[PDB]
Design a binder for this molecule. Structure first.
Ligand SMILES: OC[C@H]1O[C@@](CO)(O[C@H]2O[C@H](CO)[C@@H](O)[C@H](O)[C@H]2O)[C@@H](O)[C@@H]1O
Ligand SMILES: OC[C@H]1O[C@@](CO)(O[C@H]2O[C@H](CO)[C@@H](O)[C@H](O)[C@H]2O)[C@@H](O)[C@@H]1O
Lengths: 431, 6
């Protein structure tokens, strides 16, 4: 933007740079259409054009090679989903000139034969390639919508907020009483529709008129406003049917111990406690590594189906190092010791959601990752660990304390090239 | 802040 950005290019051109395919990111624009692309397709590139072959696809980046070049000398990388690239036949339909690049002019007086020879029975870009890209490029939200958003100052409560900015499906949410707020993706589990808090039984901070509106929607009927962000705009991993129609999938009871990603420190998985069971599978969790203080205040809401909660012992079995409970010791800490101390009970494996999606991520893969500690930053990152469904992502050239445990389907992770597509500043390794 | 502007 106004300040510049990091470019992947110096890294792109080495045979050790492995990038997560766009296919890995269900929220990424062009995710579906992308696996129709192939590492051999021909394409029209460059007021005049030429055909080139895609030799290599890394994230959104494609290695182009012009026709009639003996060597890789003039191979060039493009952002496939936003370069001046078209499917073979584009020029002919529009009357645009196909002129050989200066370096190879001499090869022929006339070029139709050569090209026809190269283009016959050759693949190009999927049917409606760029339309599909542009459709997914749009936000479900629009500027000026009010929603209920986790209060960054009091994580045990949501606070009325407003969509103020949108850059590539990432929203800025400004709180009602404030010029403070945060960035988060459209799909993130910490933003909610108006009425959510009083539906679920979660704590709410909002204006008087709004507090009255929600109360007068639960004693009687929901009054919907023109600027309400409503349920249809939000991603949910379940439906309300499951709770009111079929027998409730509810299983956690208050007091059950478990393990959870620390919402205040994504590099940490800790013992936690179910502190209040809300409606529709939502529950208030307390991370036990905190100083005994969170009395209502620092409790956090995870839905029972969240891929950030795990049975006790999860770290142990998976060779993840656990953050021990407050007053305990990493060399010493044992669940069986902790439970006998606290006289508490641990939630059984059967209570947790255990589906391992076919995510395709693997150790060493490069990707772009939002910094949840500062979500205006999207940064160069690597898949440091893949534990079934769960990823440890490391920010290249930062320490390990900045690492983030994220779900493989997190909306905070993006294919290399996302930033330039969406037009967002990209942070490279620090120097 | 912990991350300085870059
Ligand atoms: O996992 C959410 C992810 O799915 C996409 C993929 O096309 O869209 C689906 O999910 C949305 C969230 O519930 C729905 O609103 C949408 O209608 C559905 O196609 C992405 O948009 C989204 O990032
Ligand atoms: O702007 C992020 C900012 O919010 C804090 C509040 O302490 O954490 C909240 O927001 C984060 C991303 O928006 C999430 O990591 C977190 O779950 C939520 O509680 C800060 O840690 C961070 O600086």
């Amino acid at each position: 933007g106004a300040m510049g950005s990091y470019d992947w290019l110096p890294r792109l051109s080495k045979e050790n740079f492995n990038a997560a395919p766009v296919t890995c990111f269900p929220h990424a624009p062009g995710c579906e259409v992308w696996d129709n692309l192939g590492v051999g397709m021909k394409v029209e590139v460059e007021t005049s054009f030429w055909v080139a072959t895609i030799l290599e696809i890394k994230g959104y980046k494609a290695l182009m090679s012009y026709e009639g070049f003996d060597t890789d000398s003039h191979d060039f990388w493009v952002n496939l989903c936003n370069a001046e690239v078209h499917s073979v036949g584009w020029c002919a339909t529009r009357g645009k000139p196909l002129i050989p690049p200066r370096t190879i002019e001499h090869k022929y007086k006339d070029w139709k034969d050569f090209l026809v020879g190269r283009l016959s029975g050759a693949r190009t870009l999927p049917s409606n390639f760029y339309n599909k890209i542009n459709d997914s490029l749009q936000s479900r939200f629009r500027l000026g919508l009010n929603l209920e958003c986790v209060d960054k100052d009091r994580i045990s409560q949501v606070r009325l907020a407003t969509v103020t900015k949108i850059v590539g499906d990432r929203l800025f949410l400004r709180y009602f009483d404030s010029d403070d707020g945060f960035w988060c993706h459209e799909d993130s589990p910490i933003i909610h529709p108006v009425g959510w808090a009083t539906t679920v039984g979660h704590n709410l901070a909002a204006p008087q008129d709004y507090l009255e509106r929600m109360l007068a929607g639960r004693e009687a009927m929901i009054e919907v406003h023109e600027d309400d962000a409503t349920i249809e705009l939000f991603k949910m991993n379940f439906t309300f049917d499951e709770y009111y129609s079929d027998g409730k999938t509810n299983s956690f009871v208050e007091g059950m111990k478990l393990e959870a990603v620390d919402p205040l420190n994504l590099s940490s998985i800790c013992p936690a406690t179910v502190m209040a069971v809300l409606k529709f599978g939502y529950m208030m969790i307390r991370i036990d590594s905190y100083q005994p203080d969170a009395s209502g205040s620092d409790w956090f809401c995870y839905h029972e189906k969240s891929p950030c909660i795990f049975p006790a012992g999860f770290c142990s079995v998976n060779n993840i190092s656990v953050t021990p409970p407050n007053g305990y010791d990493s060399r010493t800490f044992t669940w069986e010791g902790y439970l006998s101390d606290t006289g508490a009970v641990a939630a059984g494996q059967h209570l947790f959601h255990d589906i391992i999606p076919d995510h395709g991520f693997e150790v060493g893969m490069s990707l772009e990752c939002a910094d949840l500690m500062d979500p205006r930053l999207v940064c160069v990152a690597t898949v440091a660990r893949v534990v079934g469904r769960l990823l440890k992502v490391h920010f290249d050239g930062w320490t390990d304390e900045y690492d983030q445990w994220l779900d493989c389907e997190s909306a905070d992770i993006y294919p290399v090239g996302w930033c330039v597509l969406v037009n967002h500043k990209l942070e490279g390794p620090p120097r | 802040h912990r991350k300085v502007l870059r």
